[PDB]
Amino acid sequence: SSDTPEGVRSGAGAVRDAGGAFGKKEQADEERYFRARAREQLAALKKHHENEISH
Amino acid sequence: RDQEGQDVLLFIDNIFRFTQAGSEVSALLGRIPSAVGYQPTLATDMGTMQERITTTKKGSITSVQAIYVPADDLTDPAPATTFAHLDATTVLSRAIAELGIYPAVDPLDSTSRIMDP
């Protein structure tokens, strides 16, 4: 099919638009990884010394 | 063949523009189309042409025809009616033309029906 202009060819971003098993396995892996980065970037954001003097 | 008894060849280029030009006369004449858009008479117009290409007792006529497959569908009714008439297929691969070989006939993807002990 794909070895001609006529046949169907796949583009970029076609695993998420399908919405199947691999399309759901990708959304819950971008969220369970960038949930821990909202922990380490928020715990180290409390280490401002001027806020502690106000505390 | 009928008057001199030679062994003639015959070249048609191509056979898809004979099928497709048939399904525009049969729709200008007011007829209900068959499957995907072709004519009702797709199997007799290929019958009342390619049965005159035969080996009689005087001589013969051999035909080499070019075949274009629409939308890379081998089971579309235009390259499926034609395939019941052929006896041998030869395929020209472009990947052998960049290897230097001439003629660029693929040896593995060509089949013959008369290849038989």
Side-chain angles (χ1 to χ4, degrees), chain A residues 1-45 50-55, chain B:
Chain A
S1 87
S2 184
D3 199 1
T4 200
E6 316 297 307
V8 56
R9 64 216 160 275
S10 75
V15 193
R16 286 225 62 171
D17 304 1
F22 291 100
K24 287 206 328 176
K25 191 174 136 290
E26 198 264 355
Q27 195 202 2
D29 188 86
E30 275 197 357
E31 282 301 314
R32 283 198 291 104
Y33 182 85
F34 280 163
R35 194 66 51 80
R37 300 312 107 91
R39 193 82 39 87
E40 291 173 347
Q41 291 179 253
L42 265 190
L45 204 51
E50 45 267 33
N51 291 320
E52 308 295 319
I53 301 311
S54 85
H55 279 303
Chain B
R1 177 188 66 179
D2 301 327
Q3 316 284 92
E4 322 182 3
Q6 302 172 13
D7 282 5
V8 192
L9 271 182
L10 179 59
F11 294 97
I12 306 166
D13 178 271
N14 52 2
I15 209 62
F16 178 76
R17 292 187 280 235
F18 168 70
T19 290
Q20 178 261 303
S23 80
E24 308 200 346
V25 196
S26 155
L28 268 161
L29 281 190
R31 282 164 191 176
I32 283 184
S34 171
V36 313
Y38 296 131
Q39 69 268 19
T41 60
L42 193 80
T44 53
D45 290 356
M46 201 61 54
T48 61
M49 192 265 278
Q50 307 209 355
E51 291 272 313
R52 310 165 58 176
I53 300 176
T54 175
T55 302
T56 44
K57 289 185 190 305
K58 289 195 176 182
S60 89
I61 294 176
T62 306
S63 183
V64 168
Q65 291 149 348
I67 289 171
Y68 158 65
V69 167
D72 262 358
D73 198 15
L74 264 177
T75 80
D76 209 11
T81 308
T82 318
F83 273 27
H85 283 336
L86 320 178
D87 292 297
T89 73
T90 62
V91 52
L92 309 179
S93 297
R94 198 197 276 253
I96 321 291
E98 304 316 315
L99 203 50
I101 316 293
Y102 261 73
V105 167
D106 201 293
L108 273 169
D109 309 291
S110 312
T111 77
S112 173
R113 202 206 287 270
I114 69 169
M115 186 82 209
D116 221 15

